[PDB]
């Protein structure tokens, strides 16, 4: 009801007060003592503060049994920003270019907007609708490339019995005796198979390896004071093609251990792409930047080796040299712009500070603030590090938007990124130099090769199936190369089998479930 929409009693006085502050900023700009960008910056801070204050007074005046309050505070629907826009004020509205306009909308849609306020609001509304219309298309494209890279990954066996895994933080020890729970427990620890037994320093193993790590297991682990747990994941899985059920762990839908026939690559692609329309490099293009293994914009270098750092100070850009402690030659970086801030971190002496002159740096420590290049992390820190890095960064983007995706889904894609190596030296074998060969063929045919990180698209086009590669992208090129090379498609995969009308090699289509003898027992035939 119009009566059920309550208006803040002090709204006029609040807005007048902050309008007096804004008038002071106006006089500051009139004297020439304020920059135009600084004028707009000060005004934007003023009206942000005012919108906050009318929001607070608004929530203060509303009884908690009011229907507009009840609907939001029960979690049923809506948020208080909408309530504040309705009853209190609309606030600052965006430019066509995306900037905040220095004059806020002081009206609330209960009062009704004036002509100019409404006209200004149309900018943000319009650009919002358009941005949704493009975002759905881009998210659909990323989902399609995730599907194409991951769709042949299925669970081919129960257990590969590997002892490899990753360390996952269950908590952090505060200065107080209290235990600060890790924010990532939901998407990292929970729903994993235990890699090694977690033992409290005071006694018996609380959770045995090969356990689901549910909420009871997490509560018993935390009550026992276990700050870390090593879990099995598909990143460390030893199965050549696909993954073992035990490394992938629990199926999120069923709550039990993932079934054999399950195709977890398509579930992973859909699980990553379905929220993608909520993502607003900081956004979804950062997710694409990570999955495509592109050298990031605003690249931050890392230390190639442990040693001392000589920091050169200059106006235009930073220049960094490093003298290694092993006795080797100095690794000299360069071309670090002054717009890039220095990395704040824990040094080896145990202090939390910014990178300064003459510090000591360990292997792989990030020198500059920004997004590190996963290709360099692969060379310096090894293959098992870039998996953790990529999963963590993608998870950073998806968590910053409030979307909950479990790590294993990202680990299927990331696992598909590392599957191959580069041949630098042919040696005795027939591999050509610079070529990208699968890790299984490279080790069985074995001579010199290095792990390679590939984008999901590049890794997709490199599949052994020309029929599958032709249906993804660059059909003409794929068919020309396949024709000249006289390629023979083995016709094993769920995209190839769909095309020719054959049962997909997953779920009910695998040979274990497909061919089965079913006959009644003698006791049942008797009755």
């Amino acid at each position: 009801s119009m009566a059920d929409v309550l208006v803040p009693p002090r709204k006029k006085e609040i807005l007048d007060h902050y309008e007096e502050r804004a008038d002071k900023v106006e006089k500051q700009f009139q004297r020439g003592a304020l920059n135009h960008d600084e004028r707009n910056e000060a005004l934007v801070e003023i009206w942000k503060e005012a919108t906050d204050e009318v929001g607070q007074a608004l929530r203060e005046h509303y009884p908690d049994d009011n229907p507009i309050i009840t609907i939001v505070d029960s979690g049923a629907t809506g948020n208080f920003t909408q309530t504040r826009t309705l009853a209190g004020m609309k606030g600052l509205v965006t430019n066509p270019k995306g900037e905040f306009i220095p004059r806020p909308v002081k009206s609330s849609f209960r009062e009704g907007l004036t002509v100019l306020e409404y006209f200004i609001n149309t900018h943000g509304a319009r650009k919002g609708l358009a941005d949704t219309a493009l975002r759905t298309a881009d998210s659909g494209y990323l989902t399609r490339r995730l599907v194409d890279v991951s769709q042949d990954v299925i669970v081919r066996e129960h257990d590969c019995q590997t002892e490899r895994g990753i360390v996952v933080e269950l908590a952090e020890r505060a200065p107080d005796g209290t235990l600060i729970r890790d924010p990532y427990i939901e998407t990292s620890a929970y729903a994993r198979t235990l890699g090694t037994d977690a033992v409290d320093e005071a006694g018996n193993v609380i959770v045995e390896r090969g356990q689901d790590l549910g909420d009871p297991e997490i509560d018993a682990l935390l009550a026992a004071g276990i700050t870390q747990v090593k879990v099995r994941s598909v990143l460390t899985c030893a199965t050549s093609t696909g993954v073992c059920a035990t490394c992938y762990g629990r199926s999120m839908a069923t709550g039990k251990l993932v079934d054999i026939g399950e195709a977890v690559g398509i579930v992973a692609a859909q699980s990553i792409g379905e929220p993608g329309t909520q993502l607003t490099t900081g956004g979804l293009p950062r997710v694409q930047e990570l999955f495509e293994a592109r050298v990031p914009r605003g690249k931050a270098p890392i230390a190639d080796v442990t040693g001392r750092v000589r920091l050169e100070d200059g106006e235009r850009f930073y220049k960094i040299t490093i003298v290694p402690d092993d006795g080797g030659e100095e690794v000299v970086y360069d071309k670090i712009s002054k717009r890039q801030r220095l990395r704040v971190f824990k040094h080896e002496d145990g202090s939390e500070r910014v990178l300064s002159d003459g510090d000591h740096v360990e292997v792989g420590q990030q020198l500059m603030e920004g997004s590190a290049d996963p290709h360099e992390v692969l060379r310096v820190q090894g293959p098992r590090e870039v998996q953790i890095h990529l999963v963590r960064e993608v998870q950073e983007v998806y968590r910053a938007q409030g979307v909950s995706i479990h790590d294993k889904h990202i680990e299927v894609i990331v696992r598909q990124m590392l599957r191959r190596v580069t041949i630098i030296d042919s040696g005795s074998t027939e591999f050509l130099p610079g070529s990208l060969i699968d890790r299984a063929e490279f080790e069985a045919e074995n001579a010199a090769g290095r792990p390679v990180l590939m984008g999901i698209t590049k890794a997709s086009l490199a599949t052994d199936s020309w029929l599958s590669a032709a249906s993804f992208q660059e059909t003409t090129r794929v068919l020309t190369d396949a024709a000249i090379n006289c390629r023979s498609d083995k016709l094993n995969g769920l995209k190839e089998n769909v095309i020719i009308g054959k049962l997909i090699p997953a779920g009910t289509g695998i040979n274990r479930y497909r061919n089965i003898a079913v006959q009644p027992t003698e006791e049942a035939r008797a009755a």
Binding site: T187, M252, T475, N485, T508
Partner: protein, 293 residues
């Protein structure tokens, strides 16, 4: 190295490089490039017929020029036109300005059939139009159980039509199966009991586009419902992202015992409560339900 990849490719594969130059051009069967007359006497051909036709005319004029002993400049012009027309036949616009039809529209070449989202790879292979399927607007189903969906009577009668005919000939309502078809098509009153019978415990698949995750398709037990709208259970909306603003959904009828078993077991609505991504409950209450509780 880059030259070695292609030269070695032709060396090891047994491909004769002469295959890159053609003395004979294949012609696709006419059913794949049909010609249909429209209302108004006009005819409509696939672009392929115009491309093939240009190659034919220019080739025959080249033959006439060879016989006539024409100047080498004219014969050469005709040879260039022939090469360019075969180019337009295989991949149109890959070199030069594309061959256009009326309205200055570039014709679709043989390469265009294999490429893009509208080509024969994406939408003629990975997906197709299917029988035993329908669609309609969805309305809220609040009286439904989680494993059930309301099916409009006429929709169910069309979807299950063969089953209703068979069960209609089993009883004596229909003398034979042809008269059974005539009765189902005329919606004779005898078909509603039999329809309700064959519907029982026969699952159907519901889908709302776009399908973002596998929960975008779910299996339900249909029940005959009044009206022309599909009644959807309020707890699966979150999974389908189903708002009732006029959203529509599609129904598919599994036929074989394997398809029905997969629907009842794998895809059943009440068998997937939880997000396949986060494991959190989806079929959980929201909106009015939350408010009530």
């Amino acid at each position: 190295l880059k030259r070695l990849k292609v030269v070695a490719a032709f060396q090891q594969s047994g491909n004769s490089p002469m295959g890159m130059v053609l003395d004979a051009v294949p012609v696709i069967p006419p059913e794949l490039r049909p010609m249909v007359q429209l209302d108004g006497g006009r005819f409509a051909t696939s672009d392929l017929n115009d491309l093939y036709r240009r190659v034919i005319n220019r080739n025959n004029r080249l033959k006439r020029l060879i016989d006539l002993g024409a100047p080498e400049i004219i014969v050469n012009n005709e040879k260039r036109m022939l090469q360019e027309s075969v180019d337009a036949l295989f991949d149109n616009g890959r070199r030069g300005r594309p061959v256009t039809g009326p309205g200055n529209r570039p014709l679709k070449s043989l390469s265009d059939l294999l490429k893009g989202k509208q080509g024969r790879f994406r939408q003629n292979l990975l997906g197709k139009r299917v029988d035993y399927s329908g669609r309609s607007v969805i309305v809220v189903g609040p009286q439904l159980k989680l494993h059930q969906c309301g099916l409009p009577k006429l929709m169910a009668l069309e979807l299950f039509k063969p089953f209703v005919m068979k069960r209609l000939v089993d009883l004596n309502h229909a003398q034979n199966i042809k008269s059974a078809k005539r009765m189902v098509e005329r919606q004779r009153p005898q078909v509603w009991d039999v329809l309700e019978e064959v519907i029982a415990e026969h699952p159907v698949l519901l889908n709302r586009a776009p399908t973002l995750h596998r929960l975008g398709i779910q299996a339900f037990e249909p029940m005959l419902v009044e009206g022309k709208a599909i009644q959807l259970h309020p707890l699966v909306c979150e999974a389908f992202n189903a708002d009732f603003d006029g959203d529509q959904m599609a129904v598919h009828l599994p036929l074989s015992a394997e398809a029905q078993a997969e629907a009842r077991i794998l895809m059943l609505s009440s068998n997937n409560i939880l997000s396949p991504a986060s494991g959190r409950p989806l079929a959980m209450p929201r909106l009015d339900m939350v408010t009530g509780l």
